[PDB]
Structure 1
């Protein structure tokens, strides 16, 4: 895990976007490529679209998602079965 003394890591662009969306009450999906950003408590009610590599995938944040990276909720490899 990242060091506690360094705090969490959220990309500035997404940080600017999330605060504007929450203050304006906007409900439109926030398209982002930032998979390395931790989910701050501020976006608990927002729908973020995170690039899985080829598509932006919709993730509605929930209380249980705080502290996790955004990328965790955007599977990058497609495996259905071997047969």
Structure 2
């Protein structure tokens, strides 16, 4: 849905990803950015996405190839 000439990765997200794959397995850390593009090369992170008053963990799996990090965090609360 975005441009096919360039994906959008935050620099702070990229340095968190590089430090996390330097460390290896790691407990989830709270990330505030929902504007992100993931890749099959970096599938495996346990990074958590913030949506307002509650923070939810996200465990990415093999089938997501281009989705946002904010899609798995529900911003709205319904009954």
Higher normalized helix content (fraction of residues) = 1
The 3 A distance-change label for structure 1 pair 41 and 30 is farther
CA contact under 8 A between 1:17 and 1:30: conserved in structure 2? no
After TM superposition, give the deviation of residue 39 of structure 1 in Å. 1.6
39-48 vs 58-67, which deviates more? 39-48
Q: Which runs of 5+ in 1 are unaligned?
A: none
The list of structure 1 runs, each at least 4 consecutive aligned residues, that deviate by more than 6 angstroms after superposition, is none
The structure with more radius of gyration: 1
RMSD in angstroms over aligned alpha carbons? 1.7
Q: What is the count of residue pairs matched by the alignment? A: 79
> Cα distance, 1:59 vs. partner?
0.6
Of the structure 1 ranges 34-43 and 17-26, higher mean CA displacement relative to structure 2 is found in: 34-43
**CA distance in structure 2 between the partners assigned to 1:38 and 1:56 by the alignment:** 20
Normalising to structure 2: TM-score of the pair? 0.85
How far is the alpha carbon of 1:5 from its aligned partner?
5.0
Q: CA deviation at 1:24?
A: 1.7
TM-score normalised by structure 1 residue count: 0.82
- CA apart distance, 1:10: 1.1
Are 1:34 and 1:50, in contact at CA under 8 Å, matched by a contact in 2? yes
Is the 1:50–1:57 contact (alpha carbons within 8 Å) kept by the matching residues of 2?
yes
